[PDB]
Structures are given as structure tokens and as C-alpha cells.
Write an enzyme that holds these catalytic residues in place. Structure first.
Site, PDB file in Angstrom:
ATOM      1  CG  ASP A 169      -0.039  -3.876   2.801  1.00 46.68           C
ATOM      2  OD1 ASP A 169       0.386  -3.389   1.737  1.00 46.68           O
ATOM      3  OD2 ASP A 169      -0.164  -3.210   3.842  1.00 46.68           O
ATOM      4  N   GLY A 191       3.415   6.145   9.106  1.00 48.44           N
ATOM      5  CA  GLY A 191       4.778   6.497   8.777  1.00 48.44           C
ATOM      6  C   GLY A 191       5.669   5.285   8.934  1.00 48.44           C
ATOM      7  CB  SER A 249       3.035   1.850   6.216  1.00 50.60           C
ATOM      8  OG  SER A 249       1.855   2.085   6.953  1.00 50.60           O
ATOM      9  N   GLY A 250       5.303  -0.496   5.975  1.00 54.28           N
ATOM     10  CA  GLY A 250       6.345  -1.068   5.141  1.00 54.28           C
ATOM     11  C   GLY A 250       7.557  -1.493   5.942  1.00 54.28           C
ATOM     12  CG  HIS A 298      -0.407   0.387   2.492  1.00 52.63           C
ATOM     13  ND1 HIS A 298      -0.006  -0.543   3.426  1.00 52.63           N
ATOM     14  CD2 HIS A 298      -0.161   1.601   3.042  1.00 52.63           C
ATOM     15  CE1 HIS A 298       0.459   0.079   4.494  1.00 52.63           C
ATOM     16  NE2 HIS A 298       0.376   1.382   4.285  1.00 52.63           N
TER      17      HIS A 298
HETATM   18  C1  LIG Z   1       1.437   3.383   7.342  1.00 54.33           C
HETATM   19  O1  LIG Z   1       2.564   3.895   8.092  1.00 54.33           O
HETATM   20  C2  LIG Z   1       1.047   4.367   6.327  1.00 54.33           C
HETATM   21  N1  LIG Z   1       1.178   5.713   6.406  1.00 54.33           N
HETATM   22  O2  LIG Z   1       0.703   6.271   5.321  1.00 54.33           O
HETATM   23  C3  LIG Z   1       0.253   5.282   4.514  1.00 54.33           C
HETATM   24  C4  LIG Z   1      -0.385   5.463   3.199  1.00 54.33           C
HETATM   25  N2  LIG Z   1       0.486   5.654   2.018  1.00 54.33           N
HETATM   26  C5  LIG Z   1      -0.421   5.705   0.792  1.00 54.33           C
HETATM   27  C6  LIG Z   1       0.468   5.728  -0.503  1.00 54.33           C
HETATM   28  N3  LIG Z   1       1.368   6.940  -0.420  1.00 54.33           N
HETATM   29  C7  LIG Z   1       1.397   7.955  -1.463  1.00 54.33           C
HETATM   30  O3  LIG Z   1       0.340   8.348  -2.006  1.00 54.33           O
HETATM   31  C8  LIG Z   1       2.598   8.603  -2.014  1.00 54.33           C
HETATM   32  C9  LIG Z   1       3.354   7.617  -2.929  1.00 54.33           C
HETATM   33  C10 LIG Z   1       4.850   7.935  -3.032  1.00 54.33           C
HETATM   34  C11 LIG Z   1       5.485   7.275  -4.195  1.00 54.33           C
HETATM   35  C12 LIG Z   1       5.809   8.031  -5.375  1.00 54.33           C
HETATM   36  C13 LIG Z   1       6.428   7.395  -6.493  1.00 54.33           C
HETATM   37  C14 LIG Z   1       6.728   5.997  -6.438  1.00 54.33           C
HETATM   38  C15 LIG Z   1       6.408   5.237  -5.277  1.00 54.33           C
HETATM   39  C16 LIG Z   1       5.792   5.873  -4.161  1.00 54.33           C
HETATM   40  C17 LIG Z   1       2.257   6.999   0.809  1.00 54.33           C
HETATM   41  C18 LIG Z   1       1.355   6.906   2.090  1.00 54.33           C
HETATM   42  N4  LIG Z   1       0.457   4.055   5.113  1.00 54.33           N
HETATM   43  C19 LIG Z   1       0.255   2.979   8.308  1.00 54.33           C
HETATM   44  C20 LIG Z   1       0.724   1.964   9.396  1.00 54.33           C
HETATM   45  C21 LIG Z   1      -0.393   1.534  10.379  1.00 54.33           C
HETATM   46  C22 LIG Z   1       0.156   1.065  11.733  1.00 54.33           C
HETATM   47  C23 LIG Z   1      -0.962   0.638  12.690  1.00 54.33           C
HETATM   48  N5  LIG Z   1      -0.386  -0.064  13.832  1.00 54.33           N
HETATM   49  N6  LIG Z   1      -0.817   2.347   7.540  1.00 54.33           N
HETATM   50  C24 LIG Z   1      -2.031   2.991   7.096  1.00 54.33           C
HETATM   51  O4  LIG Z   1      -2.230   4.184   7.355  1.00 54.33           O
HETATM   52  O5  LIG Z   1      -2.852   2.185   6.407  1.00 54.33           O
HETATM   53  C25 LIG Z   1      -4.158   2.351   5.800  1.00 54.33           C
HETATM   54  C26 LIG Z   1      -4.142   3.349   4.680  1.00 54.33           C
HETATM   55  C27 LIG Z   1      -3.807   2.939   3.312  1.00 54.33           C
HETATM   56  C28 LIG Z   1      -3.803   3.912   2.230  1.00 54.33           C
HETATM   57  C29 LIG Z   1      -4.133   5.303   2.500  1.00 54.33           C
HETATM   58  C30 LIG Z   1      -4.464   5.722   3.836  1.00 54.33           C
HETATM   59  C31 LIG Z   1      -4.472   4.759   4.922  1.00 54.33           C
END
Ligand SMILES: *[C@@](O)(c1noc(CN2CCN(C(=O)CCCc3ccccc3)CC2)n1)[C@H](CCCCN)NC(=O)OCc1ccccc1
Ligand SMILES: *[C@@](O)(c1noc(CN2CCN(C(=O)CCCc3ccccc3)CC2)n1)[C@H](CCCCN)NC(=O)OCc1ccccc1
Ligand SMILES: *[C@@](O)(c1noc(CN2CCN(C(=O)CCCc3ccccc3)CC2)n1)[C@H](CCCCN)NC(=O)OCc1ccccc1
Ligand SMILES: *[C@@](O)(c1noc(CN2CCN(C(=O)CCCc3ccccc3)CC2)n1)[C@H](CCCCN)NC(=O)OCc1ccccc1
Lengths: 243, 243, 243, 243
Positions: A91, A192, A194-195, A44
Site C-alpha cells: 500500500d 482521512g 490514510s497516506g 489505496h
Molecule cells: C484512510 O484514511 C482512508 N480514508 O478513506 C480511504 C479510502 N479512499 C479510497 C479512494 N478514494 C476515492 O475514491 C477518491 C479518489 C480521489 C482521486 C481523484 C483523482 C485522482 C486521484 C485521486 C479516497 C478515499 N482511506 C484510512 C486509514 C485507516 C487508519 C486506521 N488506523 N484507511 C481505510 O479506510 O482503509 C480501507 C479502505 C480502502 C478503500 C475503501 C474503503 C476503506
């Protein structure tokens, strides 16, 4: 990382930071080096939609984000074909660096678990990253890499908790089998992270048990963190990453 | 609503506005009066986590939101037990009003489609609401109820679209069978319209074909709006809503 | 700092950063070390309302903000009694450190100019700080100290520029006599640089001619940066700061 | 408006809303109709920098903002030449409409006071507007015109209070002579009310005593609201508006 402490410079040699092009190469997700040329992260973070590789870079272990940047370009983004959203599953993803990395004791790969590893409750596991220190609370500068020991629980236990205070029917699976759960109301990973990797020391060897995936908020009651279960996708990984 | 315009005062007498308690009863989702005492809406608007009824109110047909408010209390929130997230499915819910409403020429129920009805791909349909007029841009004051004619598209053709520019495997379903999609790069529903109605005039009669559910952005290329197919949950609805 | 670039670490040994107590010790203004135990800054940075010393700290010359922090407590905040707003004037203050600092070639005081020094228009002067790199554009991490060469402008000419495109009567003074001004549409100081130093090399010696005070936006046409003329308050400074 | 109530439709016929062009014609300040073709407001609302008259429109009394808009174009913007900032003074300006408006019971001009009017403390006055109901708290939709009775206090009393908890020397005057003071910790005007009127019933006739100008926050301790004293600028006004 919720409830952690700054990590010692000598730990988590595999932690990486993903950067997206913008006013500056901003960190959006974590990942882990599993091979001189490959980084494991959450799907994601880079999908489900195809992105412009050029606008993406990876930063190897850094004690403080942005401080000593030496960004590395990415040649390929490989996302598990079964993925669409984190709640549904699969994921996981792989990033191929344009050039191999030179490893050392301060920067090297993490060991993947054998297909049979279960990581039962009571196992010593840690999660790391530069994510929020709490719900809606970003890691303040100078952005130190954090670590927190999280309690692993059985999938069916977490699945039951997710149903508490929810309309979702008890028999409708929330925490799925290709997932793994850990953390509590004081210890958890957050936005932040994530991954990033979830690793446990099993017989003197550190194995990446999971990839920070999702959760309802962070460190919230009856809502433990959910991670992608690495053992579940070993075959897929090995279709790209040599042994 | 993207790409449309203010609805005549005599159109869409079933449109409803969902309100949550705060500094003022703010709109958070749309709905449709399908029975004098029942509102049909999207499950993600009021779940999966259990909500407090005290904090919810329903507002019937209004030309401009917040202007002529006459908030109605809700007696029960029935969220389909199979629902967890919009992408997975079963994004449908019911709101039982505390009192039946005295239907009039200006405010009355919409007709549910018969179990056999199959809105053919291309069908002239309309979606309505007070949602954003575009990605990240709110409906400006005085918040007029908007409408837009959107073309219904075949589930398969939609599923195929969503795979374009994505890593998701072609045989992995994104737009599932309990869903329906409509709209193009100029006409779509947006954030704020959720739970709202997608109605089609068939054989000289308005039938609600769907409930605004989700979609990647609004009016984005190869990303048409996804709606919860109503015919699919007719039996579940009728388990609670009379005739 | 708009225009200009990161400063070599052997330059601007007197630059300091003012910190306020919050989730972390955040930078809110700049300053300059003019005496082992005294920091010269802008009154609007610490007033007009009385502040709590406990919540204030001073950070000496840092190449990158927040990275090598060594916060120093403050024992006194002396705000010029005639100050109320930057546009009115007397925008200057003094911070008395709780301990004198061990000056070195890397970190030491700047020299105040003699009451006679005038700093002629079209003089080579530099302003430094961690402020915005442009209107509403934060300095991105790792937050390097920036510098920019800006031309001094005659007071009359500045006042005149500020009347261009304004209703204020020509004979009504905008840029006052206790003020000094510098910069152009490409180079200027910005939000975050306040309290900071404007130094010029005269007779082969660096003297602080001004303190970053205010301006209409940053680097805007006919709107040069305004600074508190130091020579104008030498007497007031020397009432507290040993000669 | 802090601590008031919705004004009845029959009151404040002279209240006006100033609108700036953007995604919609947004309210940014109040004003008052003092002549069929003239509007009185605060100089800081339209200056000190000259603006594009095209991007400006005036809305006559409205019970609820944006719902019954009948926007009127402006031909001239006249700002007091002495104005640069509200704290400094002369915070007054005139707006000439492109056409004279038709007066009635619901909408007519307000009477300006005779040059000798003092508006002593004790005598009750009211301030009206569509501004915030508190610090950083916006007036919620449907945005009703609010009113609140404010206590007038002598200039030297408010000036003394403005010096409490401030470094500004007691002899450096804050509340200037061309200014007027009113309100307390429960009653005051706030952001958005600027340029609006402060009226007092004198001999059975309503007179505009001041124009909402500034204040440290809203309804804050020892920081009563400050208004531009209308009697002080009568001569100026009459250089443009017929007697
Ligand atoms: C994660 O830490 C987390 N934080 O933010 C995210 C969502 N992620 C969505 C995709 N992103 C972008 O749009 C930018 C892409 C950059 C790019 C450019 C060119 C090439 C490749 C990449 C980045 C941000 N995920 C949390 C961890 C949860 C921990 C709980 N204990 N996860 C999360 O928020 O998940 C659900 C989610 C999924 C998608 C969007 C919002 C929320
Ligand atoms: C919808 O317009 C939309 N906009 O926001 C949402 C999400 N919705 C989640 C549930 N909400 C709350 O948590 C607050 C509950 C208030 C309450 C209190 C007490 C009682 C009852 C209620 C409100 C906000 N949905 C878009 C329309 C898409 C148009 C595409 N063409 N839908 C959407 O974003 O869907 C996917 C989704 C599902 C769940 C969460 C986020 C996103
Ligand atoms: C300055 O860089 C600048 N940037 O921000 C400011 C305003 N300043 C107001 C006072 N501050 C605080 O409220 C926090 C106090 C913390 C504290 C706590 C305890 C003890 C001591 C302190 C900090 C922020 N000033 C610009 C430079 C302009 C350059 C143009 N070429 N100046 C500016 O913005 O000036 C006008 C002004 C004055 C006051 C408020 C807003 C704007
Ligand atoms: C006032 O209610 C108030 N509210 O907002 C303001 C500031 N004002 C700044 C200038 N504005 C614009 O940029 C838009 C210009 C529109 C335009 C277009 C075309 C032609 C002409 C004009 C509008 C908004 N002022 C308060 C009253 C306080 C009462 C306390 N008891 N005053 C205030 O906030 O003053 C200080 C201030 C000044 C400037 C900016 C922020 C704060």
C-alpha cells in the site's frame, strides 16, 4: 487522528493533503513530501484503478485545511504494481508534481530510513493528519492539523491481536511483513489520515517509518493501526525518486 | 440483482435470506440451503470477527422479503479458517440450522457440483437475491426475489479484465484460483446478494457453481462479479455437511 | 447566499454568526449588530421553544467562519411574544450580549431605519451570510462570508407571486404586512442566512430594511425571499435597545 | 403511529395511502375514502403548490404497505383555498379518483360527522396510519397498518400546553378553532400519518372527527397531536362531495 492535540505550526513541514475535484477541492488523504517534486502516499488513496490526474491536487503543509489553499497540480501517479487492496499489501504510491517545490523551514521534505532501520518497540513515533478524531467522527472545522504519539509494537504481537475475536486461523498472517503497526485504544490514526506519514526520531533525525494504511476501525481493542513499512519499498521508491 | 427480474414463485427453492437483530430482523446477506440443516454463504457476511448467534436468524424461500417471515435460529457459524477478506479468498461459510427443514417442492436444497465439474466459460447460469438493483440503489418494496442470467467467464480472462484501467501489475493475481466470475455491464449481482447462489443447469440439473463474493461496483465495465468457486472448497464443506 | 460572491473584508462590519453547542460551536443562523450590546436576529432561529443560554454564543464579523473564532456569551434572548412560525409573522428577536463590543471600522453596528423609511420597490439592497449557495448546497470551506445584491419587491407583488402555482386563494394573504421581500431566480438568501441582515444604502447611508426570514426554497421562480420588515417592529426593538 | 399495534384486517376499511411517483410508488401521506370517488386528506400533503396529478396515485386499504398494490389514478386535487401552512389552518383537501371504487366490508367509506358534533374529552377515538413509530423512527417492513387509541382534550387545554416552555405570548393562540387535539406522551400519530383519519365511535357509528395535521414532534411532553377539525369544513366538502 485519535487522541492527539493540534500540532504546532513549526512541526511536520512535510505533511501534505491530497485533494479531489468536486464542489470544492476536498481532502481525502494525506501524504508526505520526500523530494521537491515527489509526494509519498498510500496506494489505496489513488488506486488500484487509474484516475483522472486533472481532478487531483496536492496542498502543502497547512495549519488549517482549506484556509490558505495554494493547490499544486500533479503530472504523474505511480502506484506500486503489487498493490490491489491494503490488507494484501504494497500500500504505497508516488505523486510527481508538475513543478518542483521551494523548501524552507516551514515546508520541506521528510527523511526516508536506511534499509536496515527496524523501529523497535519503545521508539518515539508520531502520526499526523486531518482525519477523524474517532470512529465516524470527522475533524470539526477549522480543521487543525493533528499529531499523536503512538506506541510501536512488533508485527507478531499485532498479528496475534488481530486474530483475537476472529475466525481467521492463527497461522494465516494478517499483519504482514511489509507492514508495521502502532497505536492503542487512546492513540491512533483514522479515516482521512490514510497516506499520511508515521515518523520517529532516531538519533536526532526524523525518519518516515510508515504510511497510514488501514486497521479495523480506529483505536479499537486488539486492533492497532497498520502502516505500510517504508524500508520494505525503498528500492521501488528510488526507481523514481532520486537520492 | 442488476439487469434481471422477479423470480417465478417456483424457481430457486433453495434461496435463503440472512437476518440480523435490530429494530427488525433485517436482511444483510443471501445464502443457499445445501442440506436440510445447512446453509452455505459467504464468509465475509459473518466474519472475520466472531458474531453472536443470538443476533442471527435464517429465512427460507420468500417471494417478497419481510412479508411471510418465519425466522429460523442458527446453531453454529462455521467460517473457513483461511478467510480474512473477500479479495484474498476463501470467502465461504456454513450455517448449521437448529433443526432440519421439511423440504418440499417449494422449498428444498440445491445440489453441489461434483469435484470434477468445470462450468465451461459461457455456461448459462443464474444468480438470485434481494440485493441492490444497481450501484447504490436498493431493491424497492415489496422486495421481490430477483434473478438474472449471467455468463460465466474464464478466470484468466477475468483477471485480465480487472487489470484493465488499473495500476496492478499484469502478473499480480486479482481474481484468484479459488474464485469464479460471471456477468457483464448489464447483468450482475450487487450489494445485498452476497453469500447468495450462482447456479447452473448442467445435464438437466441445477448445480451451485459459486457464492456471490465481491466485485468492483455492479455491472461495471471490465469489472465482472467475482464468486467463491464452490468446487474448490468441496472437501471443506463435506467435512461438516453429510450426503 | 445564492448568486453573488465573497465579501471584501471591509464590508458588512455588522454581520454576526450565531453558534450552538455541539462537537464544536456550529453556525445555525446569522444576525446583525445594531447596538454595541445588541444583536438583532430571527425568532425562528431561537424559538418558539425556550432555549438554554449556556448553549448559545455569538461570533462577530469573520471573513471565514470558524477560522478566527472569538465566541461571545449571551445574557438574554428576547423573542417577540407574537411569534410562533415564520409564515405567521413577527419573526424577530434580540440577543443581549454580556458585554458591549469595542466597535471599530472593521466591526461596528448597522443603522436602523426611521419609522418613516419605506424602501421603494426596485431598491439597491444587499443581503449577506454563510448560508447555502443553493437549494441543498452547503457553503464549502473555508466558509467565506458571501453577499448578493437583491431587488426589493412590493409586498402586493410578492404575495401575488406566491399565489402563482398555488391553491391558496388569491385574497388569502401569504406575504403579510410585517414582512418585506426581495430577490429573484438568480439572487437570494438561503438556509443558513436566517436572522441575517438585508441592508440598503439610502441617502448615502446603510440601513437594515429586513431580517432573513423564510421563502419557498432559494431563488425559485415566483418565490422571492421573505424578510421580517424592520420598520414594522422598531417600537418593539426600541423598548429594549437604547436609541 | 406511536404506541399502538397492528390493526386487524377487518378494521379501518376507509384508510388509504397516497403515493408519489419515483423509483417506486412511495407512501407519503394517509387519507380516507368518504365517497366512492372521493378521498379526504390533509392540504399540506398535496399543497400549497399545485402538483402534477400524473405523479400521484391512491392505494385503498392494505394490511401491509406495497405488498398488494392496486394503484388508482387521480383526476382532481382540491385544496381548501384558505390553506398555506398547517399551523395557520384549513389543513384539509379533497382527491377525486378517476373512477368510482367498488365498496365492500373490507373497503368502504367513513361517515362524516354532523355539524354539531363536538367530540368532547373522555370519549375514546382512534388514529391510524403507516407513519413513524416514534420520532425519526420509521415503521419497519412489512409495514403493517397501525392503530392507536388517543385521548381527546379540549382545545384551550392543548393550547395552554403548547405555550409551556415557549416564548409565544399566552394570548397568541396556537391551537386554533378549526383544529382538534388528541394523544399523549405514549399515544400519538407521527410523520407519515398526515392526512390520515382520527375517528370516534359515537352512537354506534364511526365518525371522522379530524385529519392528522401537525404537532411539535410526536408524543412529546406538553405537545399533543393536532388534527384538522372536520366539522369546521363540512360546508366546503359538500361543495364537491355529494351528500
Ligand atoms: C484512510 O484514511 C482512508 N480514508 O478513506 C480511504 C479510502 N479512499 C479510497 C479512494 N478514494 C476515492 O475514491 C477518491 C479518489 C480521489 C482521486 C481523484 C483523482 C485522482 C486521484 C485521486 C479516497 C478515499 N482511506 C484510512 C486509514 C485507516 C487508519 C486506521 N488506523 N484507511 C481505510 O479506510 O482503509 C480501507 C479502505 C480502502 C478503500 C475503501 C474503503 C476503506
Ligand atoms: C454483498 O451484498 C455484501 N453487502 O454487504 C456486505 C458486507 N457484509 C459484512 C458482514 N456484515 C456485518 O458486519 C454485520 C453482521 C451481522 C450479523 C450479526 C450477528 C450474527 C451474524 C451476522 C454484513 C455486511 N457484503 C456484496 C455483493 C457483491 C456483488 C458484486 N457483483 N459483496 C461485497 O461487498 O463484498 C466485499 C466485501 C467484504 C467484506 C466487507 C465489505 C465488502
Ligand atoms: C434560514 O436560513 C434558516 N435556516 O435554518 C432555519 C431554521 N432554524 C430553526 C431553529 N434552529 C435550531 O433548532 C437550533 C437552535 C440553536 C440554539 C440553541 C440554544 C440557544 C439558542 C439557539 C436553527 C435553525 N432557518 C432560512 C432563510 C430563508 C431564505 C429564503 N430566501 N429560513 C427558513 O428556513 O425558514 C422557515 C423555517 C423555520 C423553522 C424551521 C425550518 C424552516
Ligand atoms: C404528517 O404525517 C406529515 N408527514 O409528512 C408531511 C409533509 N409532507 C410535505 C409535502 N409532501 C411532498 O413533498 C410530496 C408530494 C407528493 C405529491 C405528488 C403529486 C401530487 C400531490 C402530492 C408529502 C409530505 N406531513 C405530519 C403529522 C404530525 C403529527 C404529530 N402528532 N405533519 C408534519 O410533519 O408537518 C410539518 C411539516 C410540513 C412540511 C414538511 C415537513 C414537516
Amino acid at each position: 487522528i485519535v487522541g492527539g492535540q493540534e500540532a504546532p505550526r513549526s512541526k511536520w513541514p512535510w505533511q501534505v493533503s491530497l485533494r479531489v475535484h468536486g464542489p470544492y477541492w476536498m481532502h481525502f488523504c494525506g501524504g508526505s513530501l520526500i523530494h521537491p517534486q515527489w509526494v509519498l502516499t498510500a496506494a489505496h488513496c489513488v488506486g488500484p484503478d487509474v484516475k483522472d490526474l486533472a481532478a487531483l491536487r496536492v496542498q502543502l503543509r497547512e495549519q488549517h485545511l482549506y484556509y490558505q489553499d495554494q493547490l499544486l497540480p500533479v503530472s504523474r501517479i505511480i502506484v506500486h504494481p503489487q498493490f490491489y487492496t491494503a490488507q494484501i499489501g504494497a500500500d504505497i504510491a508516488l505523486l510527481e508534481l508538475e513543478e518542483p517545490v521551494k523548501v524552507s523551514s516551514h515546508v520541506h521534505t521528510v527523511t526516508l530510513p536506511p534499509a536496515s532501520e527496524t523501529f523497535p518497540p519503545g521508539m518515539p513515533c508520531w502520526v499526523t493528519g486531518w482525519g477523524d478524531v474517532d470512529n465516524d467522527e470527522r475533524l470539526p472545522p477549522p480543521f487543525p492539523l493533528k499529531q499523536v504519539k503512538v506506541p510501536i509494537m512488533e508485527n507478531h504481537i499485532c498479528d496475534a491481536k488481530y486474530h483475537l475475536g476472529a475466525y481467521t486461523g492463527d497461522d494465516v498472517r494478517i499483519v504482514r511483513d511489509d507492514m508495521l503497526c502502532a497505536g492503542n485504544t487512546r492513540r491512533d490514526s483514522c479515516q482521512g489520515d490514510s497516506g499520511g506519514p508515521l515518523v520517529c526520531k532516531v538519533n536526532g533525525t526524523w525518519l518516515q517509518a510508515g504510511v497510514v494504511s488501514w486497521g479495523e476501525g480506529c483505536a479499537q481493542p486488539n486492533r492497532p493501526g497498520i502502516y505500510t513499512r517504508v524500508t520494505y519499498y525503498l528500492d521501488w521508491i528510488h526507481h523514481y525518486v532520486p537520492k
